[PDB]
C-alpha cells in the first residue's frame, strides 16, 4: 500500500517487478511454515492484536464491579533492510537478464527463517507458542524405515482417537529423510510407502526442525494471522545504492494442538 | 446480542424493558464521562485491543531481521451482577407502576462511577491514561468568581495558542460550583457569565473530580473506544431472584492533550 | 503549486493532509492580523511588487524629457524550515491518532508571529508601515472600565467625524483585557457593554500588541496583499527526517489611516 514508499525510490517499474519476482520466488520456495498452516487474510497495516476471546479478571472478590482486561495476541512487525547497487539495476534497464540481487536473496532467506522460527519454535516476548512447544503431543520413533512407518500409523490412530480426520502430512528434516532413504536399499519407494501409510498424504522436507512432525491439513487448526503480508518497500538512497526493506506484520496461533503429533 | 443470555431469564418482555428503561435513565443521567468525550462506535463483543499505531522494537542492533511488537490498548471488560426479586417483577406484571429496582439502581451507579473513574483518573493495569493525569496542562485558579472567569479566559488563550478551536465546556465539581455561586451575591448570573466567557460554551457539574477542568468539544480529541456498550444480561436464578449483570467492554484514549486544561 | 516540491517528499497523501490540517488549525487560530484586515487575493508565486500608484521624479527641472520611477511595495517572501521525524509519520500510517508534530507547531507559531509583527509593527527594510506606526491616530485611556467605554465612544465619535461608518472592533491585549475584567466585579458583562458601545461590534483579544486598538470592518481600508498564501513544501530529507518549509509571499498596506484609532 502507500506506506511502502515504493514510488519514491529511484527504480523503474521493471526494476521493482524484477525485485518482486525474485523475492516472491525465494519466499515461495523457502516458506516451509506456510505449506501446512492456515493463513488468515491480511487485516491491513493497522492491525495490532488478534483477539484470544478471553478475559483476565484483575478485580478483587469483594468488589461490586468486577472487571478484567481482554486477552489478545500482539502482532510481530519485522523490517529487514538491504541495499541494492543502483548501477546493477540500471544495467537491468540496459537489457541484462542476470542482475545481481545477492543481498535481496540473503535478506529474503533471513526473513523466511525468522518467520519459520516463529511458526515452529515460537516467541516468548510476543506470547506465541510454536509447533515444537507442544511436548504432550509427542511419540517416540526409530532410525529404521519400519519404525517411521509404524510411528506414522500410530500417529494416524492417535488422530482418529482425537477426532482429527483430514489429509495428513509428514514434516520431516531433510537430513533425517536422506538417512531414512539410505536404509531403504532397493526394496520400494520409501516416499510412496510413507504417503500410502499417511492415507494419501504428502511429505514436506524442511531444514527448520531436527526431528519429524505430523499435522493434518483439514484446516482451521493452525492459523497464521497476517496484518500485512510479506512486502518490499523503500527507505532511503545511500548515494550509490537504495536501502529497501522487507516488512511483515503477523502472529501465529495453534488453535487445536490435537492436530499435531511430534515424532522423536 | 445473543451472548447476553436474556432469553433464558424468567422475565417477560415488559419486565426486561422496564429494567432496561431504568438502567438507561440512570446511566444517561450519571455518565458524566460521555458528556464531552467522543464515543467510538461499538466494534462488537469480540473486540480485544485498540491499535495505538506504534511498534516496540525488541531486537538487537546487530540483528539482520529487526522486529518488534505492535502497541495496542487492551479493552477493559466489566461485569457487575445484581439480584432482582422475582416476586416484585411479577407484581410489575400485575400492574404495579413503582417496582422496586434498588439493587439495579445501585449497580448502575457503581458501573457509571467505575467508567468515570477510568475516564478521568485512568487505570494503570490496562495502560489507559485519564484526563486528570495530564499535569502539564494545568493552570492555577482562585476561590473568587473573578478568578474563575480569568482562569477561563486564560484557558481560552492557551487553546488559541495551541490551535484548538471549538466549543468549550467547563467540567467543574458540584460543591466547588455551589461555592462559586455563593460568592456571587446578586450581581449577575454566574453561569451566564461563565458561558459567555467560554465563547458560548456550557457548564458540566460533576461529582467525579475535585477541581475544575476545561475541554473542547470540536471532536476527535477524547476517544471512548467501545467494544460492547453498556448492556444487561442474565446469569442464573437464585430460587427467589434472578442474578442479572451489567457488562461493557471499553477503553479510553486521550489523543490530543492540547484539548485539555486543568484548573487548580 | 508545483514549485512546492511536495510530490518528491517521502510522505503519503494522508501524512501530507495531516500536516496541512495541523498547520491550518494553528494558523487559523493564531493569525490575529487576518481577523480584521482585508486580504487581497493571491496573485501567484511570481508576484514581486504591489503598485503604489505614485511616480518619484528623478529628473532635473531644466530637462526637456522629465521622467521618474514608479513607486511600488516589494513583497516579503519568508521561508521557515522544520524537520519532522519520518518514523512518527510512518506510525501515522500505522494508525496512530496523536502524531508528534511539535516542530511543525513551533514553526507555524513563529511564522504567524512574524506575519503579525509585519502587520502591526511593520518592516522598515520592505517599506511597509504597520498599524502601530500611526501615532497621529492615538487617544488616551485609563485602567478603569468606565475609561475604556468612554475611550470607545470617543473613538466612535472620531470615526463619525472622519466619515468612517462600519462595524467596529476592539483589538485589545489579552492581559489588559484580563485586568479590565478584574475591575468589573459583578456589575454586568464587560464584554457585552463594550460590544454595545461598539455599536454591535466584537472584541479581538491578541497577545500581539501592548495597548488597545480600534478599527472599522467596513472593508477596503487595511489590505494584506498576498502573492502566495501560507503554504507548506518539501526541501530535502536528512536521512532520518524530512526538512519541510512554510512559505508565504506578502506585503501590507494601510490605505486609510482614518479607519484606525490607537488607545493609550
Ligand atoms: C470480567 C468478568 C467476566 C466474566 N465472564 C463471565 C462469563 O463469560 N460467563 C459466566 O458465566 N460468568 C462470568 N463472570 C462471572 C463468574 O465467572 C460467574 O459467572 C458468576 O458470576 C460468579 O459466581 P460465584 O459467586 O459463584 O463465583 C465474569 C465475571 C467477571 C468479573
Ligand atoms: C520493527 C521496525 C519498524 C521500523 N519502522 C520504521 C518506520 O516506520 N519508518 C522508518 O523510517 N524506519 C523504520 N525502521 C527502521 C529505522 O527506524 C530507520 O528507518 C532506519 O532503517 C534505521 O537506520 P539507522 O541505521 O541510521 O538507524 C523500523 C525498524 C524496525 C526494526
Ligand atoms: C514623471 C512625471 C510625472 C508627471 N505626472 C503628472 C500628473 O500625473 N499630473 C499632472 O498634472 N502633471 C504631471 N507632471 C507634470 C507636472 O506635475 C505638472 O502637471 C506640470 O506639467 C508642471 O508645470 P510647472 O512647470 O508649472 O511645474 C508630471 C511630470 C513628470 C516629470
Residue numbers in the entry:
A (entry chain A), B (entry chain A), C (entry chain A): 4 to 267
From the paper:
Bacterial nanocompartments, also known as encapsulins, are an emerging class of protein-based ‘organelles’ found in bacteria and archaea. Encapsulins are virus-like icosahedral particles comprising a ~ 25–50 nm shell surrounding a specific cargo enzyme. One example of the redox role within encapsulins is found in the hyperthermophilic bacterium Thermotoga maritima, where the cargo is a ferritin-like protein (FLP). FLPs function like ferritin to sequester soluble iron, Fe(II), from the intracellular environment by oxidation and mineralization in an Fe(III) form.
